[PDB]
Amino acid sequence: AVKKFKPYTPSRRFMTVADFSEITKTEPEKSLVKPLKKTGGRNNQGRITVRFRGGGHKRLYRIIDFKRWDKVGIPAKVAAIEYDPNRSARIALLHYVDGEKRYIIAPDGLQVGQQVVAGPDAPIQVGNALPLRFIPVGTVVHAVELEPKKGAKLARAAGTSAQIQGREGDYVILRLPSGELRKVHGECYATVGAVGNADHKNIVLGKAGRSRWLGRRPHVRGAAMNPVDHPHGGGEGRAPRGRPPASPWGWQTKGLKTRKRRKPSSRFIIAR
Amino acid sequence: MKRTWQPNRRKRAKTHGFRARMRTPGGRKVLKRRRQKGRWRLTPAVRK
RNA sequence: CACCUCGAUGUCGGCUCGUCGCAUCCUGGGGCUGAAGAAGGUCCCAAGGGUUGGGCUGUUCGCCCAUUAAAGCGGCACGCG
RNA sequence: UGCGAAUGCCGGCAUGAGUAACGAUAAAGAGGGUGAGAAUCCCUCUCGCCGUAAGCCCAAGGGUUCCUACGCAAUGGUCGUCAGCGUAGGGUUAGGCGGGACCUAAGGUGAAGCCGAAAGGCGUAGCCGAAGGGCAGCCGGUUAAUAUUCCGGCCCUUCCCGCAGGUGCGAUGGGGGGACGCUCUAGGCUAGGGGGACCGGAGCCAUGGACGAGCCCGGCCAGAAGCGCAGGGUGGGAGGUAGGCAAAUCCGCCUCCCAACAAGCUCUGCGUGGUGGGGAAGCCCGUACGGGUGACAACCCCCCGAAGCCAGGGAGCCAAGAAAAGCCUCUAAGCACAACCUGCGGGAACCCGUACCGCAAACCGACACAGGUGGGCGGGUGCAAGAGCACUCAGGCGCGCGGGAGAACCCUCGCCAAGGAACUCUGCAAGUUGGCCCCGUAACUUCGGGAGAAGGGGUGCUCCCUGGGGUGAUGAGCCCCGGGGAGCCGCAGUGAACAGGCUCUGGCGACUGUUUACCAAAAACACAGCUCUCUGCGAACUCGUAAGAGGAGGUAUAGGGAGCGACGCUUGCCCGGUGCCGGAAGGUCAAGGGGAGGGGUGCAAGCCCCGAACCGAAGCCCCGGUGAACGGCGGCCGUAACUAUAACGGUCCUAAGGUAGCGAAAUUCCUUGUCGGGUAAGUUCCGACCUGCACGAAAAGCGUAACGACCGGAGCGCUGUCUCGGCG
RNA sequence: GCGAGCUAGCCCUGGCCAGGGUGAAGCUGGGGUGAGACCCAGUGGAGGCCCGAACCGGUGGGGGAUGCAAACCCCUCGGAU
RNA sequence: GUGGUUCGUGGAGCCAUGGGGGAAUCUGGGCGGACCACCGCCUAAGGCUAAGUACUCCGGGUGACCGAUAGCGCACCAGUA
RNA sequence: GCCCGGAUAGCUCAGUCGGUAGAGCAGGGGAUUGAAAAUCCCCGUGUCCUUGGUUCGAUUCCGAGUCCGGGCACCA
RNA sequence: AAUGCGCAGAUACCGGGAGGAACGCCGAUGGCGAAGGCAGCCACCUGGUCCACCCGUGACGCUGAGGCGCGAAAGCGUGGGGAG
Ligand SMILES: [K+]
Ligand SMILES: [K+]
Ligand SMILES: [K+]
Ligand SMILES: [K+]
Ligand SMILES: [K+]
Ligand SMILES: [K+]
Ligand SMILES: [K+]
Ligand SMILES: [K+]
Ligand SMILES: [K+]
Ligand SMILES: [K+]
Ligand SMILES: [K+]
Ligand SMILES: [K+]
Ligand SMILES: [K+]
Ligand SMILES: [K+]
Ligand SMILES: [K+]
Ligand SMILES: [K+]
Ligand SMILES: [K+]
Ligand SMILES: [K+]
Ligand SMILES: [K+]
Ligand SMILES: [K+]
Ligand SMILES: [K+]
Ligand SMILES: [K+]
Ligand SMILES: [K+]
Ligand SMILES: [K+]
Ligand SMILES: [K+]
Ligand SMILES: [K+]
Ligand SMILES: [K+]
Ligand SMILES: [K+]
Ligand SMILES: [K+]
Ligand SMILES: [K+]
Ligand SMILES: [K+]
Ligand SMILES: [K+]
Ligand SMILES: [K+]
Ligand SMILES: [K+]
Ligand SMILES: [K+]
Ligand SMILES: [K+]
Ligand SMILES: [K+]
Ligand SMILES: [K+]
Ligand SMILES: [K+]
Ligand SMILES: [K+]
Ligand SMILES: [K+]
Ligand SMILES: [K+]
Ligand SMILES: [Mg+2]
Ligand SMILES: [Mg+2]
Ligand SMILES: [Mg+2]
Ligand SMILES: [Mg+2]
Ligand SMILES: [Mg+2]
Ligand SMILES: [Mg+2]
Ligand SMILES: [Mg+2]
Ligand SMILES: [Mg+2]
Ligand SMILES: [Mg+2]
Ligand SMILES: [Mg+2]
Ligand SMILES: [Mg+2]
Ligand SMILES: [Mg+2]
Ligand SMILES: [Mg+2]
Ligand SMILES: [Mg+2]
Ligand SMILES: [Mg+2]
Ligand SMILES: [Mg+2]
Ligand SMILES: [Mg+2]
Ligand SMILES: [Mg+2]
Ligand SMILES: [Mg+2]
Ligand SMILES: [Mg+2]
Ligand SMILES: [Mg+2]
Ligand SMILES: [Mg+2]
Ligand SMILES: [Mg+2]
Ligand SMILES: [Mg+2]
Ligand SMILES: [Mg+2]
Ligand SMILES: [Mg+2]
Ligand SMILES: [Mg+2]
Ligand SMILES: [Mg+2]
Ligand SMILES: [Mg+2]
Ligand SMILES: [Mg+2]
Ligand SMILES: [Mg+2]
Ligand SMILES: [Mg+2]
Ligand SMILES: [Mg+2]
Ligand SMILES: [Mg+2]
Ligand SMILES: [Mg+2]
Ligand SMILES: [Mg+2]
Ligand SMILES: [Mg+2]
Ligand SMILES: [Mg+2]
Ligand SMILES: [Mg+2]
Ligand SMILES: [Mg+2]
Ligand SMILES: [Mg+2]
Ligand SMILES: [Mg+2]
Ligand SMILES: [Mg+2]
Ligand SMILES: [Mg+2]
Ligand SMILES: [Mg+2]
Ligand SMILES: [Mg+2]
Ligand SMILES: [Mg+2]
Ligand SMILES: [Mg+2]
Ligand SMILES: [Mg+2]
Ligand SMILES: [Mg+2]
Ligand SMILES: [Mg+2]
Ligand SMILES: [Mg+2]
Ligand SMILES: [Mg+2]
Ligand SMILES: [Mg+2]
Ligand SMILES: [Mg+2]
Ligand SMILES: [Mg+2]
Ligand SMILES: [Mg+2]
Ligand SMILES: [Mg+2]
Ligand SMILES: [Mg+2]
Ligand SMILES: [Mg+2]
Ligand SMILES: [Mg+2]
Ligand SMILES: [Mg+2]
Ligand SMILES: [Mg+2]
Ligand SMILES: [Mg+2]
Ligand SMILES: [Mg+2]
Ligand SMILES: [Mg+2]
Ligand SMILES: [Mg+2]
Ligand SMILES: [Mg+2]
Ligand SMILES: [Mg+2]
Ligand SMILES: [Mg+2]
Ligand SMILES: [Mg+2]
Ligand SMILES: [Mg+2]
Ligand SMILES: [Mg+2]
Ligand SMILES: [Mg+2]
Ligand SMILES: [Mg+2]
Ligand SMILES: [Mg+2]
Ligand SMILES: [Mg+2]
Ligand SMILES: [Mg+2]
Ligand SMILES: [Mg+2]
Ligand SMILES: [Mg+2]
Ligand SMILES: [Mg+2]
Ligand SMILES: [Mg+2]
Ligand SMILES: [Mg+2]
Ligand SMILES: [Mg+2]
Ligand SMILES: [Mg+2]
Ligand SMILES: [Mg+2]
Ligand SMILES: [Mg+2]
Ligand SMILES: [Mg+2]
Ligand SMILES: [Mg+2]
Ligand SMILES: [Mg+2]
Ligand SMILES: [Mg+2]
Ligand SMILES: [Mg+2]
Ligand SMILES: [Mg+2]
Ligand SMILES: [Mg+2]
Ligand SMILES: [Mg+2]
Ligand SMILES: [Mg+2]
Ligand SMILES: [Mg+2]
Ligand SMILES: [Mg+2]
Ligand SMILES: [Mg+2]
Ligand SMILES: [Mg+2]
Ligand SMILES: [Mg+2]
Ligand SMILES: [Mg+2]
Ligand SMILES: [Mg+2]
Ligand SMILES: [Mg+2]
Ligand SMILES: [Mg+2]
Ligand SMILES: [Mg+2]
Ligand SMILES: [Mg+2]
Ligand SMILES: [Mg+2]
Ligand SMILES: [Mg+2]
Ligand SMILES: [Mg+2]
Ligand SMILES: [Mg+2]
Ligand SMILES: [Mg+2]
Ligand SMILES: [Mg+2]
Ligand SMILES: [Mg+2]
Ligand SMILES: [Mg+2]
Ligand SMILES: [Mg+2]
Ligand SMILES: [Mg+2]
Ligand SMILES: [Mg+2]
Ligand SMILES: [Mg+2]
Ligand SMILES: [Mg+2]
Ligand SMILES: [Mg+2]
Ligand SMILES: [Mg+2]
Ligand SMILES: [Mg+2]
Ligand SMILES: [Mg+2]
Ligand SMILES: [Mg+2]
Ligand SMILES: [Mg+2]
Ligand SMILES: [Mg+2]
Ligand SMILES: [Mg+2]
Ligand SMILES: [Mg+2]
Ligand SMILES: [Mg+2]
Ligand SMILES: [Mg+2]
Ligand SMILES: [Mg+2]
């Protein structure tokens, strides 16, 4: 489901907004929000280090739980599903039985009411977090730790999902949303299922303004500049690239690979 | 039109003020030079 | 060609204003004619005055339309910012 | 150590010259006064201008410009007796207004800690930091000049110390709260405004009429408790308890109960309200201006009504909307002859600002500069509405040179016989059209548009009839939206002012946007969207020597880089060269390893030099791949039963020889190509043809509704652009 | 070494946008059907929607050119949730 | 791998030292310009040490130094207006 | 107007160290066929563009000329 | 035959793994459906049809322009997938 509009204005022809049906709560859990400093892409020198960033709606950080073992075997009821302006996915507010409320990244399928729990115990059911080694092969799973106790860092974007392909000693074989096959330690936790809000990828921004609301300032092609600014700058009219296509900093940008070859993690990767 | 001097009494002392100079080594040298030359005022005249 | 001007002599056309030349487009005078008349042809005298309005192109020019006695050619820093 | 030159330097004085100017075309005239001196100062009258301002109040800036008295050398674009100028004197009063003895924001700083040749850079806590949060004063009078500051009336807040009554009290710690978007919006009020036949008031009867429910002026403001009338906030109990980094009886969670669109508690707003003030015109006062009287002033009724208040109100939406303290609660140590809470009394309540200008002669612009400067108020009538326009109240102003005159010429403006784009690069400019209501409206279209398309008709006033609302009561009054019929006047009824000219047809760009501050606003940039590529997270990338930071408190539906640029239909062949990608072999290759063998000296033992194989990375070579990677995408001769042409053949070269579609095009040199169309006449324009000097598919190709202060062509309407000028 | 008191971007916190038009979704009702899609009304009040002041601009033209002005003035024009 | 020295890789020692390796205590070590041999000179990897040397904000004494456009930017209430 | 390249069998073209020049197609003669093609066997003509010159000797080397092709004609 | 693959270790053979599509034998000239069509196996939801019985209704029938629904392959849109 995704909302379309009649063309009562241009750019409304193609505009497309998400379907907010699975949303249950509007204002968030007051005890679970922090303010987030908006950078505008500037570092701690006052300099831009990521271009074309800034403006866009004020946002409130929802402090969310990517380590699920700190409540082993305590279960919780799924209280709400709410909009989170800080990720593509939607978050689920869950009430633990001991009274703690936490934000979880809400898997596909999960809806208000069901029990959820983390731990080596845990039935294999959407929402439950478990160490990988006890998650049966061929289970789709998200919010995956990359190293034990360092927090979930894998598959957390809307409709993403990893899948367990096999086991090797302390490690297990994962296929990531990027199709790469990597070994991950068995002790790494993972809530089972896929992320959901899976239609994120079909919203059609529609107009320039909509890009601004997400804090994306306009983005100017090197071809449009002068040689002082860009490797593609200058010429007379238009001009093709005239050289291997490059970034403002002059490195090749079609095919040229950048992963550090000597990286220690090379030992645990096997795909593309 | 809108000219280049837009006075602001906070700005002035925040920018060229005595305590402003004294933090940067460059600015302590401004005072050093201004005294050695014998300026009547090392820092711009301001009014809180 | 490179003589004045590079401590600067604003460069095309149009508009306004003209003025001069005559190697005369018209009008005036004439010779010859393969000049019957009428209309021409070509050469001579003659610079007083006249020498249209529009389409196209920045155009000068040129080509068209409609007329005309005729729709002259040149020069004046390719006259005149 | 000798000056005539250096567009030499400093200074002085000429020329232009009694010349241009005297700074908005809002505008002046007269009378009286003053003074040596008056167009220019004071005063009266008349006239004009602003009035969503050119009036009034905040804030920033400025810093005595404020008030008074005495001055006029200079400053004042003239004059000056005047001044924002000279001299002197005076003037700014706060527990409640602003800010500090309160809070935190970005950011700064910064114990701990990390980094850096030095200087220094980073940095969790903490601290600093405000037009945000918190917090108790309204109204009149008074001064030459301050006033929510003094005075008066009424009312509050905090600290300290006492009583009295309560209660396990008690933090910098736990929890609640503070606390939050945009658009639309209900009800009830308040500000503000209009009317009144009613209440009050000096007075007036003019010039033809009018002694009338005549004209003119005014009919309020602040206000504790208690009371109403609106609204907002909030469930009440008992058990369990592993969470809120100790403890909580508090919060969270669970289970019971009662309560439930309320109530009851609170809390704000509004009204009333003790009391306290104000209180016009006009007239007389001598003020530059205030006073007296009007007066024992009256102080009421109705209507309109916020955008403001009740306010954390309600609905919808997606882009998802600060923090911290005060405040409440909870418990920890500690203490409970403490402490806190609740009332009531007495005491105590500091620092700084406070004048004046403040859309401008006091600020920013070298100037008393036609420029620039944020928030609030901003009345009345009419115009459909309105902060629009015309007039006008309160208020403020006539712009610090004047007097004449009545040429050319210039600027700004009005009109123009006949013609109507003939003007010119171009309808440049100006005209025309202009509001509201109603009738009506094509191609095409992405079905929304195109549309205000086009094109018309109506519009004033008078009398009669008459339907709804809102408020009152269902009734009158007062408003609001109207509907029907008769008639009046003019050239003309949106009678002034504000207020689209319209159509057809191409190019380009999809679109709203953006840009060369100050000669370019565009077909340029951006843009949603498409593709390629990188990147597994201590990500890639960027800044930094580093620490560190951004990326991102994100995680492949994510992030970086590149090109293309809605959408529709599509995007062909070439990997030889270059780039990127993949190749655990081979060749080459640096340090290093390794030392066959040579050498210098020594009597030697030695010491010390070179040094061949061979082992040696990345890179290059080599082998592959790769086109939304850099890029490329042919020639000549022949041939069909009329000619012409060539579907067909021959052959050279290449990595391969340009597919669809478009084509004298923003590309066509020859060129004003040739043909058709428009015109009387068309180097432009539109349609075609193909010989494409020198189109062609993401430096995209061909189209496309809608959009455009873009650029081209045509026409209608209308005009001083023109014939061709004239008058003012 | 001094500069973001002009200007460009971003960050924090506040403020502003008269008045008119148009009339998306969603409701609700009616039709429709086996059930729907859908159709019609009324309500509703969306939009880098329309007209137009403030406000932000700077299209064409005229003036100005030792200017009122080292970028101004007048008419006109664009945007204006 | 570099710096210093007249020494720019040169036959390149000496002094210093970022990296690696890594001793000896007099029969020990360093040096006399690659190296070896002889012959000599010194005693590293700890430290202190007046004077003779440099400068002129300041005080004095002198001038084939200036004399108000000179002389310090300033003879004067100048690092001021 | 200024430079570079080419011209060889009837067509499209290789080539040369200075001496005897070839390829493919076309064409000719034979074969196969009922008869044409396609196929098989056999066959070059070349004054290597003109002209001058170097040579013993020149298609070959040189200098000009005709012709063609390509690139150029910029600030102005 | 050649392109192609192969000492950079191929084919052929063993073991591990990933992935997609189609379901041998049964299988038939057989079955079902209105047609297009339907094939491994398991479960759920569901349509038609046949028979037995002679119980119920009582002509409620047949056909069917328009309308509505289904409709092999290829093809088109948005996403996914991609072994042959
Ligand atoms: K771009
Ligand atoms: K360019
Ligand atoms: K010259
Ligand atoms: K003549
Ligand atoms: K000129
Ligand atoms: K001189
Ligand atoms: K003079
Ligand atoms: K004076
Ligand atoms: K002046
Ligand atoms: K504050
Ligand atoms: K507390
Ligand atoms: K009250
Ligand atoms: K005051
Ligand atoms: K006015
Ligand atoms: K005169
Ligand atoms: K003409
Ligand atoms: K009534
Ligand atoms: K209009
Ligand atoms: K296009
Ligand atoms: K524009
Ligand atoms: K641009
Ligand atoms: K972050
Ligand atoms: K290639
Ligand atoms: K290749
Ligand atoms: K290649
Ligand atoms: K060696
Ligand atoms: K053509
Ligand atoms: K072309
Ligand atoms: K014709
Ligand atoms: K014609
Ligand atoms: K435009
Ligand atoms: K609206
Ligand atoms: K040396
Ligand atoms: K040594
Ligand atoms: K020595
Ligand atoms: K020695
Ligand atoms: K010493
Ligand atoms: K002097
Ligand atoms: K001096
Ligand atoms: K060849
Ligand atoms: K041959
Ligand atoms: K494939
Ligand atoms: Mg909080
Ligand atoms: Mg450019
Ligand atoms: Mg730059
Ligand atoms: Mg470059
Ligand atoms: Mg380039
Ligand atoms: Mg350029
Ligand atoms: Mg180009
Ligand atoms: Mg990748
Ligand atoms: Mg200045
Ligand atoms: Mg002093
Ligand atoms: Mg000369
Ligand atoms: Mg001269
Ligand atoms: Mg003559
Ligand atoms: Mg003449
Ligand atoms: Mg003449
Ligand atoms: Mg023309
Ligand atoms: Mg003519
Ligand atoms: Mg000439
Ligand atoms: Mg000449
Ligand atoms: Mg000329
Ligand atoms: Mg002189
Ligand atoms: Mg002097
Ligand atoms: Mg003097
Ligand atoms: Mg003169
Ligand atoms: Mg004169
Ligand atoms: Mg004059
Ligand atoms: Mg004046
Ligand atoms: Mg007088
Ligand atoms: Mg007077
Ligand atoms: Mg004023
Ligand atoms: Mg000042
Ligand atoms: Mg005064
Ligand atoms: Mg006086
Ligand atoms: Mg004077
Ligand atoms: Mg005054
Ligand atoms: Mg004074
Ligand atoms: Mg104190
Ligand atoms: Mg710091
Ligand atoms: Mg603080
Ligand atoms: Mg405040
Ligand atoms: Mg007062
Ligand atoms: Mg005052
Ligand atoms: Mg007062
Ligand atoms: Mg307590
Ligand atoms: Mg009131
Ligand atoms: Mg009232
Ligand atoms: Mg009113
Ligand atoms: Mg009386
Ligand atoms: Mg009378
Ligand atoms: Mg009476
Ligand atoms: Mg009476
Ligand atoms: Mg009142
Ligand atoms: Mg409860
Ligand atoms: Mg506890
Ligand atoms: Mg209530
Ligand atoms: Mg009250
Ligand atoms: Mg009295
Ligand atoms: Mg609300
Ligand atoms: Mg604090
Ligand atoms: Mg009290
Ligand atoms: Mg004041
Ligand atoms: Mg003033
Ligand atoms: Mg004033
Ligand atoms: Mg004032
Ligand atoms: Mg104002
Ligand atoms: Mg003033
Ligand atoms: Mg004023
Ligand atoms: Mg000024
Ligand atoms: Mg003035
Ligand atoms: Mg001014
Ligand atoms: Mg007003
Ligand atoms: Mg009105
Ligand atoms: Mg109106
Ligand atoms: Mg007005
Ligand atoms: Mg007045
Ligand atoms: Mg004015
Ligand atoms: Mg006329
Ligand atoms: Mg007329
Ligand atoms: Mg006409
Ligand atoms: Mg014309
Ligand atoms: Mg015009
Ligand atoms: Mg007009
Ligand atoms: Mg049509
Ligand atoms: Mg329509
Ligand atoms: Mg329509
Ligand atoms: Mg009338
Ligand atoms: Mg109008
Ligand atoms: Mg064209
Ligand atoms: Mg555009
Ligand atoms: Mg628009
Ligand atoms: Mg510009
Ligand atoms: Mg601008
Ligand atoms: Mg301009
Ligand atoms: Mg412009
Ligand atoms: Mg980080
Ligand atoms: Mg582009
Ligand atoms: Mg060795
Ligand atoms: Mg290698
Ligand atoms: Mg290769
Ligand atoms: Mg392509
Ligand atoms: Mg192109
Ligand atoms: Mg391309
Ligand atoms: Mg394009
Ligand atoms: Mg096109
Ligand atoms: Mg089009
Ligand atoms: Mg635009
Ligand atoms: Mg005229
Ligand atoms: Mg005149
Ligand atoms: Mg700034
Ligand atoms: Mg700034
Ligand atoms: Mg708009
Ligand atoms: Mg508008
Ligand atoms: Mg408009
Ligand atoms: Mg306003
Ligand atoms: Mg502005
Ligand atoms: Mg302009
Ligand atoms: Mg406007
Ligand atoms: Mg050296
Ligand atoms: Mg050397
Ligand atoms: Mg020696
Ligand atoms: Mg002397
Ligand atoms: Mg001097
Ligand atoms: Mg002096
Ligand atoms: Mg030939
Ligand atoms: Mg010869
Ligand atoms: Mg069945
Ligand atoms: Mg029977
Ligand atoms: Mg089908
Ligand atoms: Mg298919
Ligand atoms: Mg296709
Ligand atoms: Mg498909
Ligand atoms: Mg696909």
Residue numbers in the entry:
A (entry chain L2A): 2 to 273
B (entry chain L34A): 1 to 48
Quote the study on this structure.
Here, we report the discovery of a series of macrolides called sequanamycins with outstanding in vitro and in vivo activity against Mycobacterium tuberculosis (Mtb). Sequanamycins are bacterial ribosome inhibitors that interact with the ribosome in a similar manner to classic macrolides like erythromycin and clarithromycin, but with binding characteristics that allow them to overcome the inherent macrolide resistance of Mtb. Members of the sequanamycin family bind in the same pocket of the ribosome as erythromycin. Like other macrolides, the sequanamycins bind in a narrow part of the peptide exit tunnel at a site that lies between the peptidyl transferase center and a constriction in the tunnel that occludes the lumen, near ribosomal proteins L4 and L22.
Two sequanamycin derivatives, SEQ-569 and SEQ-977, discovered through serial synthetic modifications of SEQ-503, showed improved potency against the Mtb H37Rv strain (MIC: 0.57 and 0.13 μM, respectively). We succeeded in co-crystallizing SEQ-569 and SEQ-977 bound to the T. thermophilus 70S ribosomes. The structures contained tRNAPhe in all three tRNA binding sites and mRNA specifically constructed to mimic the state of the ribosome after several rounds of translation. Overall, the structures were similar to that of the T. thermophilus ribosome with erythromycin, and the active sites displayed clear electron density for sequanamycin in the macrolide binding pocket. We observed a hydrogen bond between the 3′-hydroxyl of the ketoallose group at C5 and N1 on A2058. Moreover, the carbamate group linked to C8 of the lactone ring and an additional sugar mycinose attached to C13 extend the long axis of the molecule down the exit tunnel, away from the peptidyl transferase center. The mycinose group hydrogen bonds with Arg92 of the L22. In addition, G748 forms a hydrogen bond with the 5′′′-methoxy group that sits in a cavity formed by G748 and A752. Compared with classical erythromycin macrolides, we hypothesize that these additional hydrogen bonds are critical for sequanamycins as a second anchoring position to the ribosome. The overall structure of SEQ-977 bound to the ribosome is similar to that of SEQ-569 except for the carbamate group at C8, on which the NH of the sulfonylamide group forms a hydrogen bond with N1 of A2062.
